[PDB]
RNA sequence: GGAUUGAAACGCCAUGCUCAGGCUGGCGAGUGGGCGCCACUCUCCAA
């Protein structure tokens, strides 16, 4: 059940999805490191509407982002 | 029940492969070769 379907960005790309109750199954990059650069974070609405950046790099097919409600990430 | 750099967003309207052209002219299956050599219807039964 849903308040309304979701999307993959664009409303025209409906995505299915599934609860899970195991363990993360292998990935494809799980034995690779990449970078990929600085990307958006989130926005501050408070600040009118102000984004914010963090840099990204992919290891193991995971990613940790820092907490965007930090007040150290907002500077 | 606020906010997926999101919420809305046609590649669309229409146009002849057309007009026409001889597979033709002509060439001998033709020359010639024995079915031959020879062989008993024959032995006996009154009208």
Same mark, same amino acid.
């Given at each position: 059940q849903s308040f309304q379907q979701p999307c993959?960005?664009? %409303? /025209?790309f409906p995505a299915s999805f599934e609860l899970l109750e195991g363990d993360v199954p292998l990935s494809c990059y799980a034995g690779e490191k990449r970078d990929l650069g600085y990307m958006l974070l989130d926005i @501050?609405? /408070? %600040? @009118?509407?102000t984004p914010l950046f963090f840099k990204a790099v992919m290891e193991d097919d995971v990613i940790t982002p820092p907490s965007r409600t930090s007040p150290e990430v907002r500077a």
């Amino acid at each position: 059940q849903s308040f309304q379907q979701p999307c993959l960005g664009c %409303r /025209e790309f409906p995505a299915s999805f599934e609860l899970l109750e195991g363990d993360v199954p292998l990935s494809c990059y799980a034995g690779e490191k990449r970078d990929l650069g600085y990307m958006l974070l989130d926005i @501050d609405f /408070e %600040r @009118d509407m102000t984004p914010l950046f963090f840099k990204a790099v992919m290891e193991d097919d995971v990613i940790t982002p820092p907490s965007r409600t930090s007040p150290e990430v907002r500077a």
